[PDB]
């Protein structure tokens, strides 16, 4: 695209061809910048874009053990277990003392455990102010098994994926997700040479973590973001980001707003008549809304990507209620073993 | 006779509580269809959020021009609404987003967009990407010998991160706010209240009982059925013999502050309107 | 062992081979081993209560290595179901492609060989019940 | 707002509502011990005393899972006091092990007197301790 | 220290999936962690079999057949084309209505063609 | 900001004091605009909305 050496002092590229004179005009994706700005005459910016980030686009994301305890908050199941004690004592309590019996702590435990579980029970209360423990402990069963199946049949009726990552503040928060530039280029000396807050933050880790989060080229980056599972947030810019993002497979995402402003710009030789009418027929493009309409129908309307039928419950799913089915049968085959030793 | 009143009891319930859990899994799936506005076509699509510009200026100006497909519906919307969606002010379009609840969006540029989303009250945010791109600049009068250097100025204060810091600096530093899909407890939080609303009813009742099994006719029969008959034939022979059964009203709104005027307010009865 | 894509008779293990599913069925792969072993551990203390009926313990104990084998093929088998799912889920879904996974014939015989030692372990114990009461 | 915590202490009101009703009664009967009597206060006693533990042995727990601990650190004192009597000085009994085995030897009166209005001090401490701070977790 | 033998220990476990069992309950400890894990076990699966079923149904019901050609421009999960040749394949080429230059944006950069050569093709291809 | 009334081809405010020669500079939100690049030179922006 244009640098000049260190050494020789020499432009290359699209700018080394207008500096001496083998080019007249270059209408390419060449980025406005301080030091091309001093050798040749730009135009105002065809394209508005900056660095953003490139992250596997959301999946179905596969169950743990405890992933039938998800229709409840985890705050509502520690509500449940400590007022089932809790109706358990207030059972015993009122059954001892000032009875009307077979509610001993152990028959309250399993009738408040059968009254949950919705499988009835054998004995049930007789006083008065027993029936009014096991009376509410009912209604309370009937609203959230109820509402357990009604959670769980939102949830499986509208499937809705979430990214992990909405902001470059939030992959500073974090270290899951391994992000990381190209090995060289403006993106990496972008971070190199940041002072906000977050983009220091986002370069000690980028400088120092093993392995090489830097990829040598663009298409290792993205085959590194396909090939590893959401693990792995590629920054580059939003011009790509937006083209391989409509490209084939749909594997990826963009996320974010972008982190930099720079430009596109029509460059021509520093002097030349072409300088001012160029100039103003970009800003006629823009304002005709031609930049714009060129822009839908390279990224949008000739992308390969455009813009049901529930499918059964896997094992998957539900395969830790198995876990502590035959957890909890391997337990009680403990305890009977325990009974015939202390008897 | 008596399995009868058991049978027909039991098939009340079973239309009540799979209406219960059928009605509750309509409304949280319901819920969760609901997507927020993230685009200008989700904008286009859904009309049932009303939408517009100021009165004058580049936006309103922008629309009218327009050849872009989504942007040529957003116009044919805004030019044909009835109230007009234009506002007259900038301040007055914020002022309709912050009391139509979420029924109004305003079009706006994308820096007063984000001044306003920081600045109290914090009732506003900026969704989706940009609709189109421009640039504040610098200028100078086009014969100057001073639109060179602010030129390459401008240029190496974009890259040494002073126009990210200034930005920074004003929009977010000197800002005055800040900057899960399962069942909460708060929804469920009134059958733990009854729980141990419940518990403690039933405790008070443990004693009344004790001190009541341990303390220790047709006389008071006579007397409780007589003024529950009486009160009865009162509270029924009242209500019936009255007209204020049914408060019943047939008010419009109004989209200014919610200005309320009824035109068909009455209280019915079995026999007067 | 392959067939009829890129047919190599070639049967592979899966230690010397490197699709993440074969690493997958690696982590249910002890739990048929402890289901087998347990089941020769209940049946030579089961021909030993056959031999010396003067200990009626042999018999009992049995049982439970009959039916702890059991509990061990029903965790052995929700864990190689479960890890085919989760790794037919986690892939690009294409509607240009299909996939298809089925069981076989030795998938079926470990899950008949759960029903014969729940049924060894049963008629273990109600032996322990005719031998104790004699 | 209605959450974990605020629960937490919402199910130990109404449980210290039992725990001073067993206080209540623990004066009432050694104050009509002393009137008259022996092997009824034995039995009646016995019986109410491992209730207390194991609802104050509630709390530690409950407040525990809770994340509450400043009132996990008040609970303490009384905790340790109860494993002592359980554990070390258990009243041998050979049965429900508490103030049966032996009733008037004249010294343990003067302990259970003064326990029995230092229960009442702390019970009615606690009741407006976790009083206050539902009100507090419900509105903070 | 039976009402439980294998014979009722298959029936009280039949009882519990159904959600139906009135016969006698465990007593002992060891046997009422079984009869506790075994409730806790069919509570899942139940809710699961009416969750799953009410997203199925629910589902089915949602499905909006084809009835404009907003629903075809909408919808690119139908693929839809016209005769390689002729005055249907030129209307939409020419076309400046919004809904029909969609319709020819998505025919015109399709992925294998949609363009039959032949009425009867078409019509074999539906 | 800046505009051209259509009947007097004049310009007001701050495109105003640019090309009438009052001011030297113009450091504001002033939108770089295809009717005020001809009478006046702006930079490269240094805001993108
Ligand atoms: C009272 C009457 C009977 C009641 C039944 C009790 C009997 C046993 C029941 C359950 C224990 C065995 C089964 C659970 C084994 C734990 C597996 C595990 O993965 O553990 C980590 C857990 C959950 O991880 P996840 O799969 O949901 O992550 C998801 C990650 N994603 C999405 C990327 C896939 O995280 C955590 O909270 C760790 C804490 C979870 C506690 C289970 C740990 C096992 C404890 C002891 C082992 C042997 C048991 C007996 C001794
Ligand atoms: C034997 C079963 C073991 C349960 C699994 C262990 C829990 C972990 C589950 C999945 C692993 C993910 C861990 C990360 C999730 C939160 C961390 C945690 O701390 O994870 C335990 C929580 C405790 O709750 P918390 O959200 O307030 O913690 C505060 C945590 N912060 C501040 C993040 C909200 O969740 C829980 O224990 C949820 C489980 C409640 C126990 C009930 C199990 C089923 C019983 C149903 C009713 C039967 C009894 C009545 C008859
Ligand atoms: C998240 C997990 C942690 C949950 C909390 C664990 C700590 C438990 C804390 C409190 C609850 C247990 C005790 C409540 C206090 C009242 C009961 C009590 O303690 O008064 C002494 C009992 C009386 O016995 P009785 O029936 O012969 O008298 C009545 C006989 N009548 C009526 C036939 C004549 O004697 C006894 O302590 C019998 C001992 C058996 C019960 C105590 C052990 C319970 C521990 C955990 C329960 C977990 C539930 C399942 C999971
Ligand atoms: C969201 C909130 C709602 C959802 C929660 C649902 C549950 C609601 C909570 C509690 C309701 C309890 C259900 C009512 C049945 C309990 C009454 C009962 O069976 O208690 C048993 C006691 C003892 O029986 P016994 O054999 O010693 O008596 C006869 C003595 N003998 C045989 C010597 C002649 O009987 C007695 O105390 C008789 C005196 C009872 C007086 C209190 C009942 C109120 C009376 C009329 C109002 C209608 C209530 C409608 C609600
Ligand atoms: C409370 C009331 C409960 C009562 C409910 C009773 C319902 C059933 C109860 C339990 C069922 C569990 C046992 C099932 C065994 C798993 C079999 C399996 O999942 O893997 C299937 C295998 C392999 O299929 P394939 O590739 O060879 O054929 C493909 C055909 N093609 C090529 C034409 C497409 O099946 C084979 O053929 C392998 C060779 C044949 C041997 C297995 C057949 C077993 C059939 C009956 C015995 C099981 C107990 C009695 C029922
Ligand atoms: C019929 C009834 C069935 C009974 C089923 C019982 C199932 C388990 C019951 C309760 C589990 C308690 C959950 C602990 C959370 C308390 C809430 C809290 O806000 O506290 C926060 C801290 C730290 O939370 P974390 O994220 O690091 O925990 C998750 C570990 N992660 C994310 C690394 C996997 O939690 C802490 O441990 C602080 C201390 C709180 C609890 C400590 C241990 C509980 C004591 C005895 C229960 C034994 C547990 C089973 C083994
Ligand atoms: C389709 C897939 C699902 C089904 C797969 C089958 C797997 C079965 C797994 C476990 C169950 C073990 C089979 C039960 C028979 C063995 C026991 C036996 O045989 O002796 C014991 C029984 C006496 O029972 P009880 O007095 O304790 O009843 C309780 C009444 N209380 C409590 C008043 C004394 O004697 C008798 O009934 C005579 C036996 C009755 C004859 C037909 C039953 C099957 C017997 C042998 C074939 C094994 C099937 C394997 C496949
Ligand atoms: C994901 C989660 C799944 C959720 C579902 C599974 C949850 C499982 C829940 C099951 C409900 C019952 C749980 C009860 C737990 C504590 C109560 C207890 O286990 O009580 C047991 C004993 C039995 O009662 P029993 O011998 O009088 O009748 C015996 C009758 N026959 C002779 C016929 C055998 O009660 C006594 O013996 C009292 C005297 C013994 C000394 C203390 C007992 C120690 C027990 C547990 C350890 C406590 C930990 C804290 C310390
Ligand atoms: C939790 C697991 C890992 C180990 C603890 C289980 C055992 C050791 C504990 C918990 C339950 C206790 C029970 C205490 C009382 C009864 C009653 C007695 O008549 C026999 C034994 C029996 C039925 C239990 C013996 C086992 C027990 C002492
Ligand atoms: C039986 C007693 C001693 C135990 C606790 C009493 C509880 C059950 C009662 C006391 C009065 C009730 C309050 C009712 C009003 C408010 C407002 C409500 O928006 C939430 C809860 C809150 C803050 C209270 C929750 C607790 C409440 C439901
Ligand atoms: C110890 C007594 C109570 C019996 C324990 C039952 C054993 C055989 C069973 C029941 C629940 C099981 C665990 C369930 C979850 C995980 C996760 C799974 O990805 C692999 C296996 C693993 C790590 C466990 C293997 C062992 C397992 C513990
Ligand atoms: N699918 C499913 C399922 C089946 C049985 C029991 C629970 C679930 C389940 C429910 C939920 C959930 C979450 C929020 C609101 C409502 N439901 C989530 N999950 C789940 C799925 C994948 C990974 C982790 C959890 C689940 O597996
Ligand atoms: O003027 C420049 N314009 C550039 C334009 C693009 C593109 F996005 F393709 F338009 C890219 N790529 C970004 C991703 O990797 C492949 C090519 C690099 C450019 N570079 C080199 P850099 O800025 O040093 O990285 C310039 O110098
Ligand atoms: O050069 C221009 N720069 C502008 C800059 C801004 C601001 F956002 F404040 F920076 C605004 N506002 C938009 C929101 O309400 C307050 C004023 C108007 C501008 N206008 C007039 P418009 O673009 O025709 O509306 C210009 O002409
Ligand atoms: O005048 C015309 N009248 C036409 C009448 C018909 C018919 F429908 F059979 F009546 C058809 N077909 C459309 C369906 O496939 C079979 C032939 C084509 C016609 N064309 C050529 P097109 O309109 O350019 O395609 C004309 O020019
Ligand atoms: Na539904």
Request: aromatic share 14%.
């Amino acid at each position: 695209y244009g640098a000049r050496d260190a050494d020789t002092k020499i432009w290359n590229g699209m700018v080394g061809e207008l500096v001496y004179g083998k080019a007249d005009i270059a209408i390419a994706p060449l980025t406005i910048t301080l030091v091309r700005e001093e050798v040749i005459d730009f135009s105002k910016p065809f394209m508005s874009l900056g660095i953003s980030i490139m992250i596997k686009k959301p999946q179905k994301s596969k169950p743990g053990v405890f992933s039938f305890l998800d229709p409840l908050a985890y705050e509502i199941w520690m509500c449940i277990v400590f007022a089932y004690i809790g109706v358990s004592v207030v059972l015993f309590l009122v059954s001892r003392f000032s009875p009307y019996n077979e509610f001993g702590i152990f028959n309250s435990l399993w009738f408040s455990l059968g009254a949950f579980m919705q499988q009835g029970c054998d004995i049930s209360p007789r006083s008065l102010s027993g029936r009014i423990v096991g009376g509410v402990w009912w209604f309370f069963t009937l609203i959230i098994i109820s509402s357990y199946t009604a959670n769980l049949a939102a949830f499986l009726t509208v499937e809705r994926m979430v990214s992990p990552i909405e902001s470059a503040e939030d992959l500073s928060k974090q270290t899951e997700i391994a992000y990381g530039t190209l090995d060289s280029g403006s993106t990496k000396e972008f971070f190199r040479r940041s002072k906000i807050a977050v983009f220091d933050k986002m370069w000690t880790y980028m400088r120092s973590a093993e392995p090489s989060v830097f990829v040598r080229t663009t298409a290792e980056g993205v085959a590194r973001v396909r090939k590893s599972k959401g693990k792995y947030a590629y920054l580059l810019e939003s011009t790509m980001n937006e083209y391989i993002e409509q490209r084939k497979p749909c594997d990826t995402m963009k996320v974010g707003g972008n982190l930099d402003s720079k430009g596109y710009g029509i460059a021509t030789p520093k002097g030349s008549s072409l300088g001012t009418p160029v100039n103003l027929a970009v800003l006629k493009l823009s304002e005709q809304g031609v930049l714009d309409k060129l822009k839908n129908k390279w990224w949008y309307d000739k992308g390969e990507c455009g813009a049901e039928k529930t499918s059964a419950l896997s094992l998957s799913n539900v395969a830790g209620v198995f876990y502590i089915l035959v957890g909890g049968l391997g337990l009680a085959m403990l305890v009977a073993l325990i009974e015939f030793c202390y008897k | 006779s008596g399995r009868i009143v058991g049978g027909v009891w039991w098939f009340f319930t079973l239309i009540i509580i799979s209406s219960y859990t059928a009605n509750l899994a309509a409304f949280l799936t319901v819920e969760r269809m609901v997507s927020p506005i993230e685009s200008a076509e989700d904008l286009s699509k859904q009309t049932e959020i009303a939408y517009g510009t100021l009165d004058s200026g580049s936006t309103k100006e922008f629309f009218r021009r327009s050849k872009i497909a989504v942007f040529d519906k957003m116009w044919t919307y805004m030019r044909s609404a009835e109230p007009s969606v234009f506002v007259r002010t900038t301040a007055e379009g914020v002022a309709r987003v912050r009391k139509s609840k979420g029924k109004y969006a305003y079009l706006l540029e994308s820096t007063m967009n984000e001044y306003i989303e920081q600045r109290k009250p914090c009732d506003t945010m900026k969704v989706g990407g940009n609709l189109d791109s421009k640039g504040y600049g610098i200028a100078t009068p086009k014969g100057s010998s001073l639109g060179t250097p602010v030129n390459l100025a401008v240029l190496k204060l974009s890259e040494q991160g002073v126009l990210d810091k200034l930005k920074n600096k004003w929009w977010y530093d000197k800002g005055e706010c800040g900057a899960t899909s399962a069942l909460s407890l708060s929804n469920v939080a009134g059958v733990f209240y009854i729980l141990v609303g419940g518990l403690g009813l039933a405790m008070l009742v443990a004693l009344i009982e004790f001190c009541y099994k341990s303390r220790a006719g047709r006389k008071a029969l006579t007397l409780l059925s007589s003024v529950f008959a009486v009160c009865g034939l009162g509270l029924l022979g009242i209500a019936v013999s009255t007209d204020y059964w049914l408060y019943l009203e047939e008010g419009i709104i109004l989209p200014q502050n919610q200005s309320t005027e009824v035109k068909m307010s009455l209280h019915s009865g079995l026999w007067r309107v | 062992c392959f067939l009829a894509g890129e047919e190599r008779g070639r049967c592979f293990t899966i230690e010397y081979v490197m699709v993440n599913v074969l690493k997958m069925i690696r982590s249910a792969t002890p739990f048929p081993l402890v289901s087998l072993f347990f089941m020769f551990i209940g049946f030579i203390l089961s021909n030993i209560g056959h031999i010396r009926p003067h200990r009626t313990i042999l018999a009992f104990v049995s049982g439970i290595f009959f039916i702890l084998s059991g509990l061990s093929l029903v965790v052995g088998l929700v864990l190689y179901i479960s890890s085919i799912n989760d790794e037919m889920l986690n892939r690009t879904k294409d509607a240009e492609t299909y996939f298809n996974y089925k069981y076989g014939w030795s998938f079926a015989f470990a899950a008949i060989s759960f029903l014969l030692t729940e049924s060894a372990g049963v008629m273990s114990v109600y032996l322990f019940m005719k031998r104790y009461t004699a | 707002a209605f959450t974990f915590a605020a629960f937490c202490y919402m199910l130990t009101l109404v449980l210290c509502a039992s725990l001073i009703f067993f206080v209540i009664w623990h004066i009432i009967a050694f104050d009509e011990l002393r009137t008259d009597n022996i092997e009824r206060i034995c039995c009646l006693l016995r019986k109410l005393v491992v209730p207390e533990y194991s609802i104050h042995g509630l709390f530690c727990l409950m407040f525990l899972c809770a994340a509450e601990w400043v009132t996990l650190g008040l609970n303490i004192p009384l905790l340790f006091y109860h494993l002592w009597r359980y554990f070390h000085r258990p009243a041998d009994g050979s049965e429900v092990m508490y103030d049966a085995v032996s009733i008037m030897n004249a010294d343990i009166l003067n302990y259970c007197q003064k326990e029995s209005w230092c229960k009442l001090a702390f019970y009615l401490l606690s009741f407006f301790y976790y009083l206050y701070s539902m009100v507090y977790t419900l509105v903070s």
